[PDB]
Amino acid sequence: LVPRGSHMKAVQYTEIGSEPVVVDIPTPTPGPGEILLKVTAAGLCHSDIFVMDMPAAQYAYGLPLTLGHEGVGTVAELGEGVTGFGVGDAVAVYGPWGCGACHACARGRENYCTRAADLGITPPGLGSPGSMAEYMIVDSARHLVPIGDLDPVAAAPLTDAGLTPYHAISRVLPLLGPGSTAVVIGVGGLGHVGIQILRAVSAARVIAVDLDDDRLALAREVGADAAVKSGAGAADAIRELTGGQGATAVFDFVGAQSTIDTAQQVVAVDGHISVVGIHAGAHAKVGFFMIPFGASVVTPYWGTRSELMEVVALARAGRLDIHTETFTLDEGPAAYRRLREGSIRGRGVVVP
Amino acid sequence: RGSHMKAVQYTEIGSEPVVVDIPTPTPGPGEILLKVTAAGLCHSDIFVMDMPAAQYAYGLPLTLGHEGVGTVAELGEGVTGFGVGDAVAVYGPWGCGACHACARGRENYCTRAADLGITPPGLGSPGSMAEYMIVDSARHLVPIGDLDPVAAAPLTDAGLTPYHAISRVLPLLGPGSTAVVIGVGGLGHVGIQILRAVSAARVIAVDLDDDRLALAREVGADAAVKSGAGAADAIRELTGGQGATAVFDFVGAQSTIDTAQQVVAVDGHISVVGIHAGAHAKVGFFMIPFGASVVTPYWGTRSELMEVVALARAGRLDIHTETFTLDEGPAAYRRLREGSIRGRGVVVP
Amino acid sequence: PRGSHMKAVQYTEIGSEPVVVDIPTPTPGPGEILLKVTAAGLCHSDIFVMDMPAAQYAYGLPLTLGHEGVGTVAELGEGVTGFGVGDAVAVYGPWGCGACHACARGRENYCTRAADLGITPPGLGSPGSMAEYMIVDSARHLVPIGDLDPVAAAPLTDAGLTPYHAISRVLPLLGPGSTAVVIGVGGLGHVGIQILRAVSAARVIAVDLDDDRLALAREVGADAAVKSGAGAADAIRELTGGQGATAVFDFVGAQSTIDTAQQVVAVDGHISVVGIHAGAHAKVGFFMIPFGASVVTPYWGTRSELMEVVALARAGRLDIHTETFTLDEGPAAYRRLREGSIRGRGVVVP
Amino acid sequence: PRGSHMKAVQYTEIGSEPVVVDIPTPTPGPGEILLKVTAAGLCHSDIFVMDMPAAQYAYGLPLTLGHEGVGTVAELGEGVTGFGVGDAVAVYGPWGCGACHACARGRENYCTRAADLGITPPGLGSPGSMAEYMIVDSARHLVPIGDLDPVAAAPLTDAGLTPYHAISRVLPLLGPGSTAVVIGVGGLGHVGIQILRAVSAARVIAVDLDDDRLALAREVGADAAVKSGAGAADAIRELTGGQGATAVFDFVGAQSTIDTAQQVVAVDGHISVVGIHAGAHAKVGFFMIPFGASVVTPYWGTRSELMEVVALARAGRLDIHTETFTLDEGPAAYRRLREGSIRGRGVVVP
Numbered sequence A: 001l002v003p004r005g006s007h008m009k010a011v012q013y014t015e016i017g018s019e020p021v022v023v024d025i026p027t028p029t030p031g032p033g034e035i036l037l038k039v040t041a042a043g044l045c046h047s048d049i050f051v052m053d054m055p056a057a058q059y060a061y062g063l064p065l066t067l068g069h070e071g072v073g074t075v076a077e078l079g080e081g082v083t084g085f086g087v088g089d090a091v092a093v094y095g096p097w098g099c100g101a102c103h104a105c106a107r108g109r110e111n112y113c114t115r116a117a118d119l120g121i122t123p124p125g126l127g128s129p130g131s132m133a134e135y136m137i138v139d140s141a142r143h144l145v146p147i148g149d150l151d152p153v154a155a156a157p158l159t160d161a162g163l164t165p166y167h168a169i170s171r172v173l174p175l176l177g178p179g180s181t182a183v184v185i186g187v188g189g190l191g192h193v194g195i196q197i198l199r200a201v202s203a204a205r206v207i208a209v210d211l212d213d214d215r216l217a218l219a220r221e222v223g224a225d226a227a228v229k230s231g232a233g234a235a236d237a238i239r240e241l242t243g244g245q246g247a248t249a250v251f252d253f254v255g256a257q258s259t260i261d262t263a264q265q266v267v268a269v270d271g272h273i274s275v276v277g278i279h280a281g282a283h284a285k286v287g288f289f290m291i292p293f294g295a296s297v298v299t300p301y302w303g304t305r306s307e308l309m310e311v312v313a314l315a316r317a318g319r320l321d322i323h324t325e326t327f328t329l330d331e332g333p334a335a336y337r338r339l340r341e342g343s344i345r346g347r348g349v350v351v352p
Numbered sequence B: 001r002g003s004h005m006k007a008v009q010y011t012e013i014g015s016e017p018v019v020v021d022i023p024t025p026t027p028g029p030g031e032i033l034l035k036v037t038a039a040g041l042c043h044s045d046i047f048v049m050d051m052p053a054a055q056y057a058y059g060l061p062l063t064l065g066h067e068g069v070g071t072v073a074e075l076g077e078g079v080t081g082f083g084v085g086d087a088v089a090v091y092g093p094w095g096c097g098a099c100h101a102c103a104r105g106r107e108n109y110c111t112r113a114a115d116l117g118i119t120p121p122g123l124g125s126p127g128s129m130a131e132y133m134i135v136d137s138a139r140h141l142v143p144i145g146d147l148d149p150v151a152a153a154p155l156t157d158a159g160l161t162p163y164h165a166i167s168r169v170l171p172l173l174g175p176g177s178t179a180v181v182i183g184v185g186g187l188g189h190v191g192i193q194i195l196r197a198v199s200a201a202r203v204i205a206v207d208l209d210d211d212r213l214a215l216a217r218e219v220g221a222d223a224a225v226k227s228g229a230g231a232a233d234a235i236r237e238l239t240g241g242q243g244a245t246a247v248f249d250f251v252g253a254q255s256t257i258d259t260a261q262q263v264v265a266v267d268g269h270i271s272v273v274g275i276h277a278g279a280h281a282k283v284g285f286f287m288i289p290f291g292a293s294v295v296t297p298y299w300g301t302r303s304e305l306m307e308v309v310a311l312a313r314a315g316r317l318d319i320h321t322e323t324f325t326l327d328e329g330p331a332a333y334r335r336l337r338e339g340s341i342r343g344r345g346v347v348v349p
Numbered sequence C, D: 001p002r003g004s005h006m007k008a009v010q011y012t013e014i015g016s017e018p019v020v021v022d023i024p025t026p027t028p029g030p031g032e033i034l035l036k037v038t039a040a041g042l043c044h045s046d047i048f049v050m051d052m053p054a055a056q057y058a059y060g061l062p063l064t065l066g067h068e069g070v071g072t073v074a075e076l077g078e079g080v081t082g083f084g085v086g087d088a089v090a091v092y093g094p095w096g097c098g099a100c101h102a103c104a105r106g107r108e109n110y111c112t113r114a115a116d117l118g119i120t121p122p123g124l125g126s127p128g129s130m131a132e133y134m135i136v137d138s139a140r141h142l143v144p145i146g147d148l149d150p151v152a153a154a155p156l157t158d159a160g161l162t163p164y165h166a167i168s169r170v171l172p173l174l175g176p177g178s179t180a181v182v183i184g185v186g187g188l189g190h191v192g193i194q195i196l197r198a199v200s201a202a203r204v205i206a207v208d209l210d211d212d213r214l215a216l217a218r219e220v221g222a223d224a225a226v227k228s229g230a231g232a233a234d235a236i237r238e239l240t241g242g243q244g245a246t247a248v249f250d251f252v253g254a255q256s257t258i259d260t261a262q263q264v265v266a267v268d269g270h271i272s273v274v275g276i277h278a279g280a281h282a283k284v285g286f287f288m289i290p291f292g293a294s295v296v297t298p299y300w301g302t303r304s305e306l307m308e309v310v311a312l313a314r315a316g317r318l319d320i321h322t323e324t325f326t327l328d329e330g331p332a333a334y335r336r337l338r339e340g341s342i343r344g345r346g347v348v349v350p
């Protein structure tokens, strides 16, 4: 698609319960401190679905909403006083914006900003204009990470399919020494990247759990030491491979009550369960004799800027091979339909 | 406001700081202009001002003061998250904001800051010892609210710097550990209070001056020791001859560093905090216990600065301050030289 | 220096969408004027003609769209005086022969020879204004707009002129104590409500489906607002104490709406069917419409009226909302129009 | 070559879809060269052959697909000198006998003996490039690419070469002041424009179906762009002062486009029919086409041509939009190929 003036194509969620639609909205202009990006790739994500399935009550993200919370692009116009990027610069968009000033933000951890709810700072494509348009605004230089000559299509999923699993893993990386076992439940958009991250940054043994045969082989293709079929037999299968020793960490990318249950029955004493996937209602039960002593559970949120940099560094060293399928802006809504039915293999990416 | 303002500047190499009149700055996009409420002095200012002409490229004239507190006076274009009137402490060690270190909150260790020419206020950029001051970014301001400006000033250095040193190794300082603090004047005095507040470690003070030792007692040091060749053996006796987990040397002379190496425990840590040009630890087999790490730490982090204020706000830190006026700036530096300042000096415009 | 060719938004094939295409920059023959287009409005009419089926097509293609044109004088043809280069002019849409009785009376839009001679308007038969340059046939089709913003002027050549002429036809009836009912507070109706407040002292009643438009109507001078549909007739009658309405300006033109009109018009009143819905018509017969109630489908407006619309605008008395598009985005603007998500009138700026 | 088995995509049964397979790794005979495939492009032509029916089937499957092949030399067959193991080479597609008069003139694509000798192109009868490794028959059929990205080079072997040949056939006619009409700005047409810009001073006019396609034409160096359809002949002539275009490269190849072409082509000009549509053909007779305007259906490209295409590429003068797939997504890509849901050219990277 060619740049053609004062408006741009965007993929907007317009009405609750409706499908998203392509619209020609005005191209924004960066205020002072803001940056305008020419979007070069915008990732689709299952999360996008969840948000679009909230009822009139639940949903508090305001309409219309340009979707797309995984976004990379080139610098188009710098707002007033923004130095430290030049027009043409390829950047990835750091997703979970924060106040930049509370204790958490001051330590890098914006994803856990203690203020961004109050101040109404929301991420692009999840409350602020997202990346699935020809252009987007980013509030602050602080939320741009350089990516150099990385391919945008492969870069885009890094902002979430890379960052989110990286963070979860990172939370307990000291535990994942040689000898340790990491269980990755689900080999979807996130699972298949988590596996690679586990290999690149740790020496843990990785055991993948999914339903389809071709998923298990995908798991093997990307570095999973072993692969087992998810379901009521998955716990025993894992205990089998672990010699009954139980796994150091379980990263549940699926996040169903099924999988969380498995995770609780395989997790090692003094291990960790990280519930990364959203299924409304699904929850671990952490109480004496319902989970091993010392086994900590958490639901992590996205990742940190230093993480996002670290993820880009992995990709730029050829350590991450994200599986993509390219779409057009126009194909935007059609891509969503593809996602609901779970036929997109790997991660879908829109390319203006 | 006004067209110009007073400022304590270092104008030529090897001269005294003089109060001169210079344009009142105006904040560009991204900047904040503060009405300064407190500007601190320390020996660091004296150090920089004793660099010879020979070692000199650029810098002059310089507005001094890297220990700055003020209130927001005007917001540059775009700047949000502060309102005019806000009481703020200036974070000293500025960084690029975008490298790995800066993204982790460790701007004191910004790897791009040399090459980009980002110098701290009063050490390369305009300092806090003037009527007004520019801060480059909102992210260099830390709220203090209620806290008295004059108490806040020294925290930005005298507080931050020991805090960071101790923070690097605080995991080691659990119940039963021993911290040695060499030099209990400026940074060490705050150092003991920090150690008392964030740790259960046994604190041993070491100094040359006898009454300094007694005062160090008052702020929570568990034993006193007199610097010198006796110091090592005395400390060992106090630690039942098992060595000290951590030695924070705030003097930083060869003598003290030598003491440090002779008292540090196996797998311990030595923080060389005080600068004496040339002086250094000798880290190598059979010259320091196995596993005993040594570092020259630099200033502190934003997180840390916040934690410092929090400590102060809760009444856990107390530095004695002596107040000067902005005109008395040069007169204050003079007093610092002859060591006739009890506690830290603070200029109040 | 203009270049041999220029971009133009054109309807190239029946059922297709508008495309930005390259075509020769024209030069003015004797009597013609060339304008550098400064603004060009779209409206639903563009959509209507674009929806004519193949069955019906005979000639016309390709067609540079845009009957709502504003420009500045670029080059004058041989023999043309009365306009200088640089002059900002709006283009009079419904071109006529100039020599029949209706033309001579200053009612070109009702020219009796225009069809026989194949005099078609720009954007609907002749090259329209949705290009970098455009040709106007006579100086008599240019109307000075002074320093009025071209973007503000563009919609007036239709959204302004059309409801003006429809109201003008029956303006003497609309003295103090009269009631005008405006059906359709979309494009034309929004401007029409403004016209009624400026040129008359009638009481204006807005009628529309969408409540958001009903509020918008009030802010522009609507004395009262009623929701379209079966309830509307009774509801209007309520607001007039049963006495009907002097004049009903139907901007929608739907059978249902014309039907409401016939039930609410006063005796010796008037109904102006201004919107087009193929086949929708009034039924003017005994006991099926009040005595003396006259019905008409007006067509656009006269040059005199257009000057008057400009003067209203320049005096601050007409405030139509515009969203600007660039020439390259022409088709973009048409799809927004087609899915009806343009607040007010869209205007294209070469 | 390590690994006795390798992955590949193949056409295994008539009318059915290509499927992923595990076949033995080939070993280069005397005079053959074995490549490790760095990139294997797709194109519509692959569909065309898979679409031919059962009835019109004689002798030639399973078939490793892929006629756009790039690789590094893995192992050198007996006596083969001229390349080092590790050398990045593109596979020239139209294999010829190498000994007929055409072949001795560089023009191997028009070899008069290759059909009589069943010499078929790689992936169109011979083992294709779409696998981990492939066999090339002769060093004559490798062209070095140096440090050019394989993903970029692969399309060049067809989307580059084919237009390039077409254009070259008549390049002496494309002097300053000539006009070249490119019909269709899809894969080939896009690259055709950029070639015309590098190698000639001809003025280029693009014709296409879609508003985006026309803007893209303009972006890649078209001086003008008009919409295909009944109107497209006159559209062009308007741009050319009614003079007609010296050359017309129809990359679409519909009867309608060839018809357009016959109406725009200049006297003593040329029409190059470069796209396949079963049945579509020019009508070269008196009064059906200007005197001296020649027509041809060119076939692919010559070896020295591929080399020149690579030189353009290496000097940043040839842009080609690529989308990467994996060997397993091969069949997936071929589906997307059918729905014309792929921008530019698809490339498979093992």
Ligand SMILES: NC(=O)C1=CN(Cc2ccc(CO)cc2)C=CC1
Binding pocket: A045, A047, A050, A069, A126, A160, A164, A275, A276, A277, A278, A300, A301, A302
């Ligand atoms: N931290 C996580 O598990 C997820 C982070 N995101 C962005 C997002 C943010 C908020 C929601 C609603 O929960 C969902 C998705 C992407 C994958 C899962």
Ligand SMILES: NC(=O)C1=CN(Cc2ccc(CO)cc2)C=CC1
Binding pocket: B042, B044, B045, B047, B048, B157, B161, B272, B273, B274, B275, B296, B297, B298, B299
């Ligand atoms: N150990 C440290 O980093 C300290 C921080 N400062 C500011 C500073 C830093 C560096 C210099 C160089 O002379 C001076 C002054 C004050 C005491 C020591």
Ligand SMILES: NC(=O)C1=CN(Cc2ccc(CO)cc2)C=CC1
Binding pocket: D043, D045, D048, D049, D124, D158, D162, D273, D274, D275, D276, D297, D298, D299, D300
């Ligand atoms: N006009 C040409 O020469 C073409 C060359 N190719 C390869 C090809 C094409 C068609 C066939 C017959 O189906 C065979 C091989 C790609 C595009 C056009």
Ligand SMILES: [Zn+2]
Binding pocket: A044, A045, A046, A047, A048, A069, A070, A160, A161
């Ligand atoms: Zn996502």
Ligand SMILES: [Zn+2]
Binding pocket: A098, A099, A100, A101, A102, A103, A104, A105, A110, A112, A113, A114, A115, A116
């Ligand atoms: Zn925050």
Ligand SMILES: [Zn+2]
Binding pocket: B040, B041, B042, B043, B044, B045, B066, B067, B157, B158
């Ligand atoms: Zn200091």
Ligand SMILES: [Zn+2]
Binding pocket: B095, B096, B097, B098, B099, B100, B101, B102, B103, B107, B109, B110, B111, B112, B113
């Ligand atoms: Zn930095």
Ligand SMILES: [Zn+2]
Binding pocket: C041, C042, C043, C044, C045, C046, C067, C068, C158, C159
């Ligand atoms: Zn109109």
Ligand SMILES: [Zn+2]
Binding pocket: C096, C097, C098, C099, C100, C101, C102, C103, C104, C108, C110, C111, C112, C113, C114
């Ligand atoms: Zn007439």
Ligand SMILES: [Zn+2]
Binding pocket: D041, D042, D043, D044, D045, D046, D067, D068, D158, D159
């Ligand atoms: Zn091909």
Ligand SMILES: [Zn+2]
Binding pocket: D096, D097, D098, D099, D100, D101, D102, D103, D108, D111, D112, D113, D114
């Ligand atoms: Zn031959």
